Ligand binder design. Structure first.
Ligand SMILES: CCCCCCCCCCCCCCCCCC(=O)OC[C@H](CO[C@@H]1O[C@H](CO[C@H]2O[C@H](CO)[C@H](O)[C@H](O)[C@H]2O)[C@H](O)[C@H](O)[C@H]1O)OC(=O)CCCCCCCCCCCCCCCCC
Ligand SMILES: CCCCCCCCCCCCCCCCCC(=O)OC[C@H](CO[C@@H]1O[C@H](CO[C@H]2O[C@H](CO)[C@H](O)[C@H](O)[C@H]2O)[C@H](O)[C@H](O)[C@H]1O)OC(=O)CCCCCCCCCCCCCCCCC
Ligand code: CLA
Ligand code: CLA
Ligand code: CLA
Ligand code: CLA
Ligand SMILES: CCCCCCCCCCCCCCCCCC(=O)OC[C@H](CO[C@@H]1O[C@H](CO)[C@H](O)[C@H](O)[C@H]1O)OC(=O)CCCCCCCCCCCCCCCCC
Ligand SMILES: CCCCCCCCCCCCCCCC(=O)OC[C@H](CO[C@@H]1O[C@H](CS(=O)(=O)O)[C@@H](O)[C@H](O)[C@H]1O)OC(=O)CCCCCCCCCCCCCCC
Ligand SMILES: CC1=C(/C=C/C(C)=C/C=C/C(C)=C/C=C/C=C(C)/C=C/C=C(C)/C=C/C2=C(C)CCCC2(C)C)C(C)(C)CCC1
Ligand SMILES: CC1=C(/C=C/C(C)=C/C=C/C(C)=C/C=C/C=C(C)/C=C/C=C(C)/C=C/C2=C(C)CCCC2(C)C)C(C)(C)CCC1
Ligand SMILES: CC1=C(/C=C/C(C)=C/C=C/C(C)=C/C=C/C=C(C)/C=C/C=C(C)/C=C/C2=C(C)CCCC2(C)C)C(C)(C)CCC1
Ligand code: OEX
Ligand SMILES: [Cl-]
Ligand SMILES: [Cl-]
Lengths: 32, 50, 240, 59, 56, 37, 61, 188, 148, 30, 449, 58
């Protein structure tokens, strides 16, 4: 079921995209 | 506003589509005993919408 | 207010005013009572508004006479009989025949005695058939049982549905109290009413007058003796 | 209470005790309508239709 | 009809007035007590300059 | 459904309403990253 | 035309994913907004260009 | 304790909402959420399922032995239902009343026939199918829908199905369970 | 103990009985449930009610205006007329595309005549409502000479 | 009769409430 | 960022650190206003994607699409949905604008100045400056005033809005004559909130709604100009607390009432919340049942006027406590219900049973039977009956979600009023950190209080 | 503490005496008869639907 699988891929790319900001900003720089 | 409590009545169903009772179905038997007897002369119509 | 004055109001203007509980007064038209053309008429917008509820109460005292006493009303504005269909016949000399078939021809009404006793009744004229001259259209209607057969008392018993006994007293479940548990009597009684046509407006076919009825009150499904209630007031119809 | 013209007793002087006595809610025929003393004809009509409840609950 | 009503149960009158004396009750009692507050306003402080409230 | 020039993008749309629940959770991750100072 | 709209909208998702991650990273790095100013301006002016492309291409469907 | 694997990620076996039944001489598709009742309302009951939720929703088959070979031998469909009028119950209240509304005097219940038919199957035997709405003075369930169907089998035996559904449940989806059971009734 | 009694009501479903049962099963589409599919599928049933709607307008609505029965003229224009907007789209969606704009253009101004008659009947202006009605019947005949 | 007993128990409970407020043992400081 | 010992606020009250930080507080609001527009974009497109045309709008769990349908975008006569693309444009224009609001909200929260007082003196503000606070209050009333004229222009000029009371059935109606009479417009406001009045939840036609938004549009443009050119008068200096948490608490008590109003608005009103889109009201579905069994039993040969109930009041038609012929049953409580399917059957003296024995229209019994099976009772897992009902349908009315969410949000924001108005009045007084322990004011009072 | 006997004697000798107590006694009769065919399966009691207590139209 590709319509259900893309909804899961769209979930993981976005649910990471918040902590991806927090992880990357912690490593390089650090003004959070 | 009639949002109501969880209604898990006839939720557990085996194969061949038959209803397995739960404790929620026993609460429903106690629930629908009260509602066929509360305000016992008010209701002219089958749905207690009020 | 007349009929055309009521119908010239919207629903929100007449709502909550008590105007909706009233019969249309017949302001135009004369009391000559003969120029009404003889023949048959079907009787629509036939409505009856009472003015007094008096009830033949036995005296509080020992040697007191039993008369009709003034009462105050417990139900609010739910007592007018309104929009009844039927047939109206008048003779060549003045003999008139009033008859209603369908419509709102009953009104449950609680009225309270001076003394604190609440007597309830349904004010009805249902299935009326009355004959006589235009000062009296003497006839009888039926008063049904005030509660239906499927009415249930506080102990859960009744006529059509119910236990038929006192279930909370399991040793004296059926006993000397069979008057109020074993049969719930829903037999309909009869009442008599006297109509008197007072004004005729023949150009619009509208007639009005004064009525006088006496009917039984309520038997509590056959548990108390029903009392007699004399209802007077006005009435109105449209001969078309 | 139920608007069906059967009255429900809740008073100590009408055969009730502390457990079963209650000030009965307003009539179902009234509904959410505002029913003070001055909107009744008599004071007994106010007492019949559950008038005291709406005066307690509003205050 | 049978009894006497005030007949204002669902009529939607402004502040629930239907006799005009009820509106003068509203303005009389408000106006009497506005005037007592106004005459007594000389004991409450003259908060006349701009930074003169309970502020933070 | 969506207009049919956009219905292949309907898998992304089913994820879009829950995103402001993740915005309140991101405030807790950011405060955990500074150790709740 | 439909297929160039879906490519332009997929491109809008990747550019928006570049901004949802990148723009808070460029902002809260120390002296990162002065160094990476012209990248974000090229990112925003591409993102804003891609919105008005897809809206005009929706008129042709 | 025989080891069969659990149905992880597996296809369902019954989404039809009907269970096929085979009694003695008949076959029908019962409503799948209904369960057997241990009640014999009538003389001749073989099976009687009722709903799990309320016991008003139920069906019953009745096999009376008869001397006649065809259902037309019982007379017409109008003269048939007055013979088998015991299916609708009996008014156990022989009290006098004129205050119930929408009924004749002294009647606290009034059945109303709404539909008849004369449908058949692949064997050739015609059926007498009925559809009633039986209202009561208290008016429980908003009335009760009756689905009566009757035929005589190949062994001179009168098979009568009667599906009773309360009207409150009728518009809320028990028409699909009842009509699907009522059309599935075939006497072999 | 007495049996229950039957009544010959096998023709009430032929007239009007099984109509609220079609509007309560949630397996049908709502265009089937609201009566919208049945109006679009049978053209003559709309052509029956539209000729019936002008019988309620051309003859039955002026009578309440000279006797000034406002709440019986506000709702004369909504009771059986209360399908006329949906009906005049179905009768106009059977035409040519340059005939449909002629149909829906005339249908649009008859809407503006009824909604102006309603407002005339709302402030109880008898001199305006008796005038707005004659405009309304003229715009009514222009639509019905176009879609049928 | 019992309603007389009921009101005496309700008046008596409201009496103790009146004495517990306006005749309470006053909390002495220090 | 910022920490505790430089502020005195922990991590769990750290938005209180940016009270006196004007620029950071601006980015806090613009990023939050991004979220309201983002939710309104995302939940719109979620409801467009999950819209099924062969089902009602209220059956599908749609709460945002009935708002755009009430404006009349993409609806036909009788509430039929013509096209869904007007609902799609509303979803994208919010979802794209949320990135713009999200950008400047993230900008002023991270890169923009902390306090915009010394560099940008037009936008700078101190909370105790009573002129600048009314100046910002006046700017936003003009925005609310011009926003209220958008509804008037869309109803009068830009296609019209959906009138469910329209002659010929409900469709989109240009409101050519909005009611500008002050006795009618300000008559709702002084009306009682109880039964038969419903304060402002009984506004029964769209001409009062659009004509009332003319009044709320002009008064907010005039009241905005009033606060730009004035400062609060000395009696208002005397009554208010002039801190930023006070101004929040003033807004929290105002908006917590508005949550209670829109709770009872969506539950009772069916003009601004049309039943074709939101489903029947509580009163509407209960009155629809009594109307359904009145038409069911006239056809089965019964005089519904003369039909006496088991209590003796009347099974189908009884009399209202003010004398109107109404429906009988437990739905006597909802006798003051008005509906566009029911009002064609209603004369002056309540319902007209001559009109109701002969002139029941087939579309009225279509619609009232729909409303009976879509009563606003359900369950929390969206079952859809009384609590004694099996898992058959999948339904909770939008009115049941809109009222229940906005009573809870209206209740908590009244609690947020009581929190912040107590705190800001106490923090301006100085004792919000505690008793001073040197001059405890109870110790300077006379005992036996 | 099931019954107040002085209010059961009165409510059986007076068919119009209703309190919230006698309403509670009727609701308990509803709970008892409608659950015990399924709450107590060891009793193996079958109740025909016409013997369970029932108000009007529910
Ligand atoms: C069906 C109908 C129902 C009824 C209608 C219902 C709706 C009514 C809503 C109307 C709007 C109400 C809003 C009122 C705001 C009041 C705010 C306030 O606190 O207002 C505060 C201000 C304070 O004003 C300032 O007050 C100051 C106080 O000074 C005093 O103190 C000073 C130092 O502080 C100096 O010492 C000075 O000398 C001394 O006089 C100064 O005097 C200033 O000059 C003065 O401008 O008041 C003012 O501006 C004026 C206030 C407004 C006018 C109030 C009129 C009240 C009614 C009058 C009619 C009564 C009828 C009686 C009938 C009798 C028969 C029965
Ligand atoms: C005096 C102060 C009273 C305070 C509120 C009492 C509310 C009483 C009430 O019955 O209010 C209900 C009213 C709605 O009234 C209804 O209004 C309805 C209007 O609908 C009518 O008009 C509509 C027009 O389309 C429809 O046509 C419909 O068919 C027709 O019936 C009807 O008139 C009803 O009879 C009428 O009851 O709500 C309103 O007016 C809005 C007012 C706000 C209600 C607030 C409720 C919550 C209160 C806070 C509780 C939490 C506190 C927490 C503390 C910690
Ligand atoms: C609507 C919610 C909301 C908003 C707008 C803010 C906003 C803010 N908070 Mg608050 N906060 C919130 C909820 C919120 N907070 C909650 C729920 C808590 C409790 C957990 C806190 C607890 C808290 C504390 C304890 C503090 C703040 C502070 C701040 C400010 C500085 C932010 C900072 O330096 O972070 C830096 C962090 C990052 C850069 C991490 C990355 C996060 C980015 C912004 C996410 C953006 C994602 C988005 C998709 C980007 C889109 C871009 C666009 C182009 C499309 C800022 C204005 C601080 C303050 O007062 O400053 C003086 C402070 O000390 N907050
Ligand atoms: C406040 C306005 C509001 C309203 C009236 C609705 C109403 C509705 N929504 Mg929408 N929704 C909202 C806000 C709202 N939602 C928000 C903020 C979001 C973003 C998350 C969504 C996202 C959303 C989606 C994605 C979907 C809906 C759906 C629905 C429908 C069914 C919802 C349901 O089953 O809830 C079930 C009931 C609950 C979840 C109870 C909520 C109680 C909350 C969680 C508080 C619990 C208290 C707890 C202790 C506090 C937690 C914090 C603590 C641990 C510290 C209904 C029409 C569905 C639908 O019909 O789509 C067509 C659907 O698929 N909504
Ligand atoms: C967002 C809206 C908003 C806000 C927050 C303010 C805030 C303020 N205004 Mg402004 N104003 C606004 C909109 C707003 N205004 C608009 C739209 C107008 C044009 C109509 C005005 C016209 C205006 C004037 C002319 C004045 C203010 C004043 C004030 C100040 C004190 C107000 C006060 O204490 O009232 C307290 C209110 C009362 C004491 C009235 C009694 C209220 C009770 C509940 C009865 C209300 C009856 C009423 C008819 C409403 C009935 C319905 C109701 C129950 C819902 C304060 C700074 C005063 C000031 O200092 O400005 C310089 C002032 O003189 N305002
Ligand atoms: C628009 C409204 C608004 C605004 C701007 C503020 C702003 C502020 N509040 Mg106030 N507050 C509000 C509404 C508001 N509040 C309401 C409605 C309540 C009642 C619930 C409170 C109760 C409250 C308390 C008790 C406190 C504040 C505090 C504060 C300050 C910092 C808050 C912070 O960093 O949060 C940080 C955020 C968190 C720690 C996360 C909390 C999340 C909770 C668990 C809810 C989760 C959401 C969930 C889905 C909702 C479920 C309920 C639903 C069923 C309706 C700041 C000045 C604090 C302060 O310093 O006082 C000045 C403080 O102690 N507020
Ligand atoms: C916490 C907040 C809770 C939620 C609040 C949400 C808003 C509710 C209030 C706004 C709606 C009501 C607007 C005013 C209505 C009105 O004038 O009522 C007018 C009504 C009308 O009163 C009745 O009206 C009828 C006609 O419709 C008849 O005439 C009746 O005879 C008459 O009694 O009066 C009341 O109901 C009581 C009002 C007095 C009580 C007010 C308490 C105030 C407390 C202090 C407030 C300080 C400020
Ligand atoms: C009518 C209400 C409803 C009826 C309720 C019926 C039940 C009541 C139950 C409660 C009874 C009282 C409990 C104990 C009170 C106590 O100890 O107070 C202690 C205080 C002592 O305070 C000190 O008393 C001092 C005086 S002295 O010391 O007592 O002489 C004084 O100087 C000093 O200032 C003061 O601090 O007593 C007094 O102040 C006054 C003396 C109180 C006398 C007892 C009253 C008994 C009730 C009679 C009421 C009428 C009943 C018949 C009609 C219904
Ligand atoms: C529109 C769109 C978009 C955008 C999106 C967005 C905007 C997103 C965001 C997102 C986000 C923003 C996310 C976030 C997330 C977060 C999270 C997911 C978190 C979680 C957490 C957890 C889970 C934990 C927590 C904790 C801590 C840490 C502390 C406290 C305690 C606890 C444990 C609770 C894109 C571009 C894609 C494109 C498409 C469309
Ligand atoms: C400060 C801060 C914060 C906050 C933040 C925020 C709140 C933000 C916001 C943000 C936002 C508010 C964002 C937004 C964004 C958006 C976007 C980015 C969008 C985009 C869009 C798109 C992408 C679209 C698309 C489409 C179309 C066009 C159509 C079809 C469909 C689709 C979907 C595909 C926190 C709390 C974390 C913490 C502290 C810090
Ligand atoms: C749109 C619309 C409309 C209109 C509306 C309007 C026009 C409104 C206005 C309104 C208003 C006009 C409102 C007002 C309000 C006010 C208030 C609510 C007040 C409050 C007050 C306060 C809050 C105060 C407090 C206090 C005191 C007590 C004294 C002084 C100081 C203090 C602060 C302490 C109508 C309905 C027709 C229809 C629908 C739509
Ligand atoms: O109000 Mn006391 O409980 Ca609410 O459901 Mn209908 O209404 Mn009456 O019944 Mn069930
Ligand atoms: Cl009860
Ligand atoms: Cl009912």
């Amino acid at each position: 079921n590709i319509e259900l699988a893309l909804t899961l891929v769209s979930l993981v790319l976005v649910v990471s995209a918040g902590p991806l900001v927090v992880v990357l900003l912690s490593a390089r720089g650090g003004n959070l | 506003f009639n949002l109501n409590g969880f209604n898990f009545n006839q939720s557990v169903v085996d194969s061949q589509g038959r209803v397995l009772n739960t404790w929620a179905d026993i609460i429903n038997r106690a629930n629908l005993g009260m509602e066929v007897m509360h305000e016992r002369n008010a209701h002219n119509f089958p749905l207690d919408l009020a | 207010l007349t009929f055309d004055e009521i119908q010239g109001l919207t629903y929100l203007q007449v709502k909550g005013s008590g105007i909706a509980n009233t019969c249309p007064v017949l302001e135009s038209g004369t009391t000559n009572l003969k120029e009404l053309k003889a023949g048959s008429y079907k009787l629509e917008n036939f409505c009856i508004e009472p003015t007094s509820f008096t009830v033949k109460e036995e005296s509080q005292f020992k040697g007191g006479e039993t008369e009709f006493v003034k009462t105050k009303l417990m139900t609010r504005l739910t007592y007018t009989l309104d929009a009844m269909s039927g047939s109206f016949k008048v003779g060549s000399d003045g003999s008139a025949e009033l008859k209603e078939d369908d419509g709102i021809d009953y009104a449950a009404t609680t009225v309270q005695l001076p003394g604190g006793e609440r007597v309830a009744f349904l004010f009805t004229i249902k299935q009326f058939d009355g004959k006589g001259t235009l000062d009296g259209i003497k006839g009888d209607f039926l008063v049904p049982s005030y509660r239906g057969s499927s009415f249930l008392d506080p102990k859960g018993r009744g006529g059509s549905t119910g236990y038929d006994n006192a279930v909370a007293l399991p040793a004296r479940a059926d006993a000397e109290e069979l008057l109020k548990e074993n049969v719930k009597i829903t037999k309909a009684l009869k009442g008599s009413a006297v109509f008197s046509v007072a004004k005729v407006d023949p150009v619009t076919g509208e007639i009005a007058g004064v009525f006088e009825s006496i009917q039984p009150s309520d038997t509590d499904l056959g548990a108390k003796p029903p009392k007699d209630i004399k209802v007077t007031g006005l009435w109105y119809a449209q001969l078309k | 209470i139920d608007g069906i013209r059967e009255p429900v007793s809740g008073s100590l002087l009408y055969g009730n005790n502390i457990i079963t006595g209650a000030v009965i809610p307003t009539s179902n025929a009234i509904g959410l309508h505002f029913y003070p003393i001055w909107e009744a004809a008599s004071l007994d009509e106010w007492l019949y239709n559950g008038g005291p409840y709406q005066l307690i609950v509003c205050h | 009809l049978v009894d006497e009503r005030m007949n204002g149960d669902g009529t939607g009158r402004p502040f629930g007035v239907n006799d005009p004396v009820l509106g003068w009750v509203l303005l009389g009692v408000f106006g009497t007590m506005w005037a007592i507050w106004f005459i007594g306003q000389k004991d409450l402080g003259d908060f006349e300059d701009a930074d003169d409230g309970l502020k933070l | 459904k969506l207009p049919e020039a956009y219905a292949p993008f309907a898998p992304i749309v089913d994820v879009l309403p829950v995103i402001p629940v993740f915005f309140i959770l991101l405030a807790f991750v950011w405060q955990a990253a500074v150790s709740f100072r | 035309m439909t297929s160039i709209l879906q490519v332009a909208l997929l491109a809008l998702i990747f550019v928006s994913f570049a901004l949802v991650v990148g723009v808070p990273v460029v902002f809260a790095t120390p002296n990162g907004w002065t160094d990476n100013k012209g990248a974000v301006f090229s990112g925003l002016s591409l993102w804003l260009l891609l919105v008005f492309v897809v809206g005009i291409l929706n008129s042709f469907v | 304790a025989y080891g069969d694997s659990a149905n992880v990620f597996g296809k369902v076996t019954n989404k039809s909402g009907f269970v096929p039944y085979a009694g003695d001489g008949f076959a029908l598709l019962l409503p799948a959420k209904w369960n057997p009742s241990k009640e014999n309302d009538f003389p001749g009951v073989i099976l009687r399922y009722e709903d799990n939720f309320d016991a008003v929703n139920n069906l019953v088959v009745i096999a009376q032995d008869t001397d006649k070979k065809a259902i037309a031998d019982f007379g017409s469909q109008d003269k048939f239902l007055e013979s088998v009028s015991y299916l609708l119950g009996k008014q156990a209240y022989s009290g006098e009343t004129q205050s119930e509304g929408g009924f004749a005097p002294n009647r606290v219940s009034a059945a109303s026939l709404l539909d008849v038919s004369t449908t058949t199957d692949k064997k050739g035997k015609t059926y007498y199918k009925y559809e009633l709405l039986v209202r009561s003075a208290d008016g429980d369930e908003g009335g009760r829908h009756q689905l009566i169907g009757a035929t005589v089998g190949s062994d001179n035996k009168l098979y009568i199905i009667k599906i009773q559904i309360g009207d409150k449940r009728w518009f809320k989806g028990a028409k699909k369970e009842a009509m699907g059971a009522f059309d599935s009734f075939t006497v072999v | 103990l007495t049996p229950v009694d039957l009544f010959d009501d096998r023709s009430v479903r032929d007239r009007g009985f099984d109509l609220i049962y079609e509007a309560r099963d949630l397996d049908l589409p709502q265009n089937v449930r609201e009566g919208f599919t049945q109006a679009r599928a049978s053209l003559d049933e709309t052509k029956k009610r539209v000729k019936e709607s002008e019988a309620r307008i051309d003859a039955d609505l002026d009578v309440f205006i000279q006797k000034s029965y406002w709440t019986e003229a506000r709702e004369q224009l909504r009771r059986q007329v209360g399908t006329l907007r949906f009906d005049l789209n179905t009768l106009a969606s059977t035409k040519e595309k340059e005939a449909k704009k002629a149909a829906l253009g005339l249908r649009k101004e008859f809407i503006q005549a009824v909604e102006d008659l309603d407002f005339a009947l709302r402030e109880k202006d008898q001199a305006s409502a008796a005038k707005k009605l004659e405009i309304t019947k003229a715009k009514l005949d222009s639509v019905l000479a176009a879609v049928l | 009769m019992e309603a007389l007993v009921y009101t005496f128990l309700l008046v008596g409970t409201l009496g103790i409430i009146f004495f517990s407020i306006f005749f309470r043992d006053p909390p002495r400081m220090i | 960022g910022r920490d505790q010992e430089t502020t005195g606020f922990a991590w769990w009250s750290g938005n209180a650190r940016l009270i006196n930080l004007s620029g950071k507080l601006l980015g806090a609001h613009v990023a939050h206003a991004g979220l309201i527009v983002f939710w309104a974009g995302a939940m719109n497109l979620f409801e467009v994607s999950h819209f099924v045309p062969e089902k009602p709008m209220y059956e599908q769990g749609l709460i945002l699409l009935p708002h755009i349908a009430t404006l009349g975008y993409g609806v036909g006569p009788g509430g039929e949905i013509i096209d869904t693309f007007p609902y799609f444009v509303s979803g994208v224009l919010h979802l794209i604008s949320s990135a713009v609001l999200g950008f400047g909200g993230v900008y002023h929260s991270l890169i923009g100045p902390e306090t915009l007082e010394e560099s940008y003196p037009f936008f700078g503000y101190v909370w105790k400056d009573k002129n600048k606070m009314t100046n910002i209050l006046g700017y936003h009333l003009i925005m609310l005033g011009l926003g209220a004229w958008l509804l008037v222009w869309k109803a009068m000029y830009f296609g019209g809005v959906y009138d469910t009371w329209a002659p010929g059935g409900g469709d989109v109606r240009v409101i050519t004559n909005p009611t500008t009479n002050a006795a009618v417009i300000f008559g709702y406001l002084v009306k009682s909130p109880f039964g038969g009045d419903g304060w402002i939840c009984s506004v029964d036609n769209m001409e009062d709604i659009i004509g009332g938004h003319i009044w709320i549009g002009t008064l907010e443009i005039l009241g905005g100009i009033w606060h730009i050119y004035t400062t609060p008068w000395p009696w208002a200096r005397r009554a208010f607390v002039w801190s930023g948490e006070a101004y929040l608490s003033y807004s929290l008590g105002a908006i917590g009432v508005m949550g209670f109003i829109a709770c009872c608005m969506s539950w009772f009103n069916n003009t601004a919340y049309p039943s074709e889109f939101y489903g029947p009201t509580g009163p509407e579905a209960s009155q629809s049942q009594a109307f359904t069994f009145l038409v069911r039993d006239q056809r089965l040969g019964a005089n519904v006027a003369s039909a006496q109930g088991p209590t003796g009041l009347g099974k189908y038609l009884m009399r209202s406590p003010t004398g109107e012929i109404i429906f009988g049953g437990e739905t006597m409580r909802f006798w003051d219900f008005r509906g566009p399917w029911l009002e064609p059957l209603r004369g002056p003296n309540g319902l007209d049973l001559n009109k109701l024995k002969n002139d029941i229209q087939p579309w009225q019994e279509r619609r009232a039977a729909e409303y009976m099976t879509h009563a606003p009772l359900g369950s929390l897992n969206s079952v859809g009956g009384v609590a004694t009902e099996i898992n058959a349908v999948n339904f909770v009315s939008p009115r049941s979600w809109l009222a229940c969410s906005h009573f809870c949000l209206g209740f908590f924001f009244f609690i947020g009023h009581l929190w912040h108005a107590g705190r800001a009045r106490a923090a301006a007084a100085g004792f919000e950190k505690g008793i001073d322990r040197f001059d405890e004011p109870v110790l300077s009072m006379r005992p036996l209080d | 503490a099931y019954d107040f006997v002085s209010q059961e004697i009165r409510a059986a000798e007076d068919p119009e005496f209703e309190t919230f107590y006698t309403k509670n006694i009727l609701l308990n009769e509803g709970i008892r008869a409608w659950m015990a065919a399924q709450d107590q399966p060891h009793e193996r009691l079958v109740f025909p639907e016409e013997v369970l207590p029932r108000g009007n139209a529910l």
